[PDB]
């Protein structure tokens, strides 16, 4: 039962981190503090299939 | 596999659409679908949204936006999850 | 509105004859003797 | 002299809260508004349920065709309303 | 001169909405202690 | 004065620390994530806060300074937690009957309000005879109310799950029964109000319309819409308990009002009651 409780908490903390990460991502997106990184890139020249 | 939940997945979403299902990425959806952690997978009638329904978590259901590639459907198969598509009526594409 | 359409033989049918009397009994428009005697001696 | 323009404007406004005569679109606007006003009021709703109210207007070419167009449009909308856009969920699944 | 102004008092018949509005009129405030 | 400067500096410091807390709460990821976690339970929060707003407005109306908006708000809160909530909690979801009957209650409460704006200057209470208004002990009133809610919630719970009730030709009965109860209630209220000078001061005896089928048609119409809600969800036992409690209270109140108009009108209401005996149900009660 203790293992059940702890692994419940383990997967629940995994979900905690993923939703909290998403919320922090969308919170930092608008303020422009993450400008230039891979989460807010800038346009450049076009490219082809080859 | 004779679970009492035969077809109570898509209809229940069509009723409790008023719920707020938070967003989740594609690759984590794959990484948790493979894990045999999810109870069902639900297809939207335009195949541009997919409402997951796992077995444990808070919340159970989310929204995962989807790219159309075959390996998606391959892991949906090899995971062994409940596959269904919500059918909308024929006015909703005329209301739009 | 409704007497313009109803057939004559349906009016002479016993059902329509007994429907009117129950309409009068329920609405309460029974005209009696003493009513008309009081009316005739009420006039001049 | 600018007050005369406003005088004419609001006098026309006064005239269009009447039914003297004007363009057809505004007349249709007033007719659907009057229908909404009649329908919303309950004391105006009950007096509609008297068959004489229908009958006086019924006993008094454009109207029939206009009413039969809305018949086939409603039939179309009702027929499309019962079918799922995907009939065969399984065959597309 | 009267025949023209009495001929034009209704050049067009009353609309369906007008007749329907008039056909369902009410008592309008008789039972008041003031009027 | 220096005290103004000191209190202004103190207010500035308190505002600064409060804004610091507000700013570190707004940009907090875990706060927003748990906010979204509690976003899952939104429809039940308005349903409970309307109860608090309603009891606040109801205490104010009991004190007597309530505007008409607060009175209609009390009406709306009662109609929501009697015809929107019973299948929102005991099924988790609404589709079909609850919205229709929730608006039907709002539609049915609005004849004593509509008639008394039309055939009056306004809703202002006219001075009248204090013994004319029927008054009943408050414990009886709350017993009637509790019985009515127990019947309605019991219809909600004993009734089956929401989307499994049929349609087609079996959902025409509630339509015609609701039309009948609205028609009969409207006729009863109109025939009761077209004779009285003041709010409830009848001059003659009303023996027209539903009064020639039953002695109390207003109460029986309220009874019939009760049965209509209970029959829309197809639960006979809760309909029977609703019938029992409404019969008890309505019969008590009908007995006091009947003896009042018997005393007040003499032979007229006596012969009216001899013409129609059935008090609530046609040739059943
Ligand atoms: C708008 C009016 C308020 C509706 C109030 C209804 C309500 O409270 O219902 C709660 C149910 C869900 O509860 P649970 O059993 O899912 O925990 O939740 C619902 O079913 C809400 C349905 C809300 C419909 C929109």
Short mmCIF file of N, CA, C and O and ligand atoms in Angstrom, two decimals, chain B residues 12 15-19, chain F residues 40-48 50 80-81 84-95 99 102, ligand 1:
data_model
loop_
_atom_site.label_atom_id
_atom_site.label_comp_id
_atom_site.label_asym_id
_atom_site.label_seq_id
_atom_site.Cartn_x
_atom_site.Cartn_y
_atom_site.Cartn_z
N UNK B 12 -19.47 10.55 -23.92
CA UNK B 12 -19.27 11.28 -22.67
C UNK B 12 -18.46 12.55 -22.88
O UNK B 12 -18.69 13.56 -22.20
N UNK B 15 -20.78 15.09 -24.32
CA UNK B 15 -21.61 15.72 -23.29
C UNK B 15 -20.78 16.71 -22.46
O UNK B 15 -21.12 17.89 -22.37
N UNK B 16 -19.70 16.24 -21.84
CA UNK B 16 -18.89 17.12 -21.01
C UNK B 16 -17.78 17.80 -21.81
O UNK B 16 -16.62 17.84 -21.38
N UNK B 17 -18.13 18.34 -22.98
CA UNK B 17 -17.28 19.30 -23.66
C UNK B 17 -17.02 20.57 -22.85
O UNK B 17 -16.02 21.26 -23.11
N UNK B 18 -17.88 20.90 -21.89
CA UNK B 18 -17.68 22.12 -21.10
C UNK B 18 -16.50 22.03 -20.14
O UNK B 18 -16.13 23.05 -19.54
N UNK B 19 -15.92 20.85 -19.97
CA UNK B 19 -14.74 20.68 -19.13
C UNK B 19 -13.55 21.40 -19.77
O UNK B 19 -13.50 21.62 -20.99
N UNK F 40 -11.03 22.80 -13.56
CA UNK F 40 -11.80 21.61 -13.90
C UNK F 40 -13.19 21.60 -13.27
O UNK F 40 -14.07 20.87 -13.75
N UNK F 41 -13.42 22.39 -12.23
CA UNK F 41 -14.62 22.28 -11.40
C UNK F 41 -15.42 23.58 -11.45
O UNK F 41 -15.92 24.07 -10.43
N UNK F 42 -15.56 24.16 -12.64
CA UNK F 42 -16.15 25.49 -12.75
C UNK F 42 -17.68 25.54 -12.63
O UNK F 42 -18.17 26.49 -11.99
N UNK F 43 -18.49 24.60 -13.22
CA UNK F 43 -19.95 24.82 -13.19
C UNK F 43 -20.57 24.75 -11.80
O UNK F 43 -21.64 25.32 -11.57
N UNK F 44 -19.92 24.06 -10.87
CA UNK F 44 -20.45 23.93 -9.51
C UNK F 44 -20.14 25.14 -8.64
O UNK F 44 -20.78 25.31 -7.59
N UNK F 45 -19.20 25.99 -9.04
CA UNK F 45 -18.87 27.17 -8.25
C UNK F 45 -19.93 28.26 -8.38
O UNK F 45 -20.31 28.90 -7.39
N UNK F 46 -20.42 28.50 -9.61
CA UNK F 46 -21.47 29.50 -9.80
C UNK F 46 -22.77 29.03 -9.15
O UNK F 46 -23.50 29.82 -8.55
N UNK F 47 -23.05 27.73 -9.25
CA UNK F 47 -24.22 27.13 -8.63
C UNK F 47 -24.24 27.26 -7.12
O UNK F 47 -25.32 27.31 -6.53
N UNK F 48 -23.07 27.31 -6.47
CA UNK F 48 -23.02 27.51 -5.03
C UNK F 48 -22.91 28.98 -4.64
O UNK F 48 -23.54 29.39 -3.65
N UNK F 50 -24.33 31.39 -6.24
CA UNK F 50 -25.66 31.95 -6.40
C UNK F 50 -26.50 31.68 -5.16
O UNK F 50 -27.40 32.46 -4.83
N UNK F 80 -32.88 27.50 -10.49
CA UNK F 80 -31.65 26.83 -10.89
C UNK F 80 -31.35 25.65 -9.98
O UNK F 80 -31.12 24.52 -10.44
N UNK F 81 -31.37 25.87 -8.66
CA UNK F 81 -31.16 24.70 -7.81
C UNK F 81 -32.38 23.84 -7.63
O UNK F 81 -32.30 22.92 -6.80
N UNK F 84 -32.15 22.86 -12.38
CA UNK F 84 -30.93 22.79 -13.18
C UNK F 84 -29.88 21.95 -12.48
O UNK F 84 -29.13 21.22 -13.12
N UNK F 85 -29.82 22.09 -11.16
CA UNK F 85 -28.89 21.37 -10.29
C UNK F 85 -29.27 19.90 -10.04
O UNK F 85 -28.34 19.06 -9.99
N UNK F 86 -30.54 19.53 -9.82
CA UNK F 86 -30.86 18.12 -9.46
C UNK F 86 -30.37 17.11 -10.49
O UNK F 86 -29.93 16.02 -10.11
N UNK F 87 -30.44 17.39 -11.80
CA UNK F 87 -29.71 16.56 -12.71
C UNK F 87 -28.35 17.07 -13.15
O UNK F 87 -27.80 16.54 -14.12
N UNK F 88 -27.78 18.07 -12.47
CA UNK F 88 -26.41 18.47 -12.72
C UNK F 88 -25.47 17.80 -11.73
O UNK F 88 -24.27 17.64 -11.99
N UNK F 89 -25.99 17.41 -10.56
CA UNK F 89 -25.16 16.71 -9.59
C UNK F 89 -25.42 15.20 -9.60
O UNK F 89 -24.48 14.40 -9.57
N UNK F 90 -26.69 14.80 -9.66
CA UNK F 90 -27.06 13.39 -9.62
C UNK F 90 -26.94 12.71 -10.99
O UNK F 90 -27.23 11.52 -11.11
N UNK F 91 -26.54 13.47 -12.01
CA UNK F 91 -26.09 12.90 -13.28
C UNK F 91 -24.74 13.44 -13.74
O UNK F 91 -24.07 12.76 -14.52
N UNK F 92 -24.31 14.61 -13.28
CA UNK F 92 -23.07 15.21 -13.71
C UNK F 92 -23.16 16.01 -14.99
O UNK F 92 -22.16 16.63 -15.38
N UNK F 93 -24.32 16.03 -15.64
CA UNK F 93 -24.44 16.65 -16.96
C UNK F 93 -25.89 16.94 -17.31
O UNK F 93 -26.79 16.19 -16.92
N UNK F 94 -26.13 18.02 -18.05
CA UNK F 94 -27.48 18.41 -18.43
C UNK F 94 -27.67 18.30 -19.94
O UNK F 94 -26.85 18.80 -20.71
N UNK F 95 -28.76 17.64 -20.34
CA UNK F 95 -29.20 17.63 -21.73
C UNK F 95 -30.67 17.21 -21.75
O UNK F 95 -31.02 16.17 -21.19
N UNK F 99 -33.03 22.15 -18.88
CA UNK F 99 -33.10 23.52 -19.40
C UNK F 99 -34.54 23.91 -19.72
O UNK F 99 -34.98 25.02 -19.40
N UNK F 102 -36.43 24.32 -16.43
CA UNK F 102 -35.91 25.51 -15.76
C UNK F 102 -36.47 26.79 -16.35
O UNK F 102 -36.86 27.69 -15.60
C1 LIG G 1 -25.03 26.90 -16.05
C2 LIG G 1 -25.83 26.51 -14.83
C3 LIG G 1 -25.14 25.77 -13.74
C4 LIG G 1 -25.27 24.33 -13.97
C5 LIG G 1 -25.02 23.83 -12.61
C6 LIG G 1 -24.92 22.37 -12.79
C7 LIG G 1 -23.98 21.60 -11.91
O1 LIG G 1 -23.65 22.05 -10.91
O2 LIG G 1 -23.43 20.27 -12.18
C8 LIG G 1 -22.20 19.64 -11.78
C9 LIG G 1 -21.90 18.52 -12.76
C10 LIG G 1 -20.57 17.79 -12.55
O3 LIG G 1 -20.27 17.19 -11.27
P1 LIG G 1 -19.50 15.82 -11.07
O4 LIG G 1 -20.29 14.71 -10.49
O5 LIG G 1 -18.98 15.71 -12.43
O6 LIG G 1 -18.51 16.09 -10.08
O7 LIG G 1 -21.59 19.34 -13.80
C11 LIG G 1 -22.43 19.62 -14.84
O8 LIG G 1 -22.94 18.75 -15.28
C12 LIG G 1 -22.54 20.95 -15.38
C13 LIG G 1 -23.24 20.98 -16.65
C14 LIG G 1 -23.09 22.42 -16.89
C15 LIG G 1 -23.81 22.72 -18.12
C16 LIG G 1 -23.32 23.92 -18.86
#
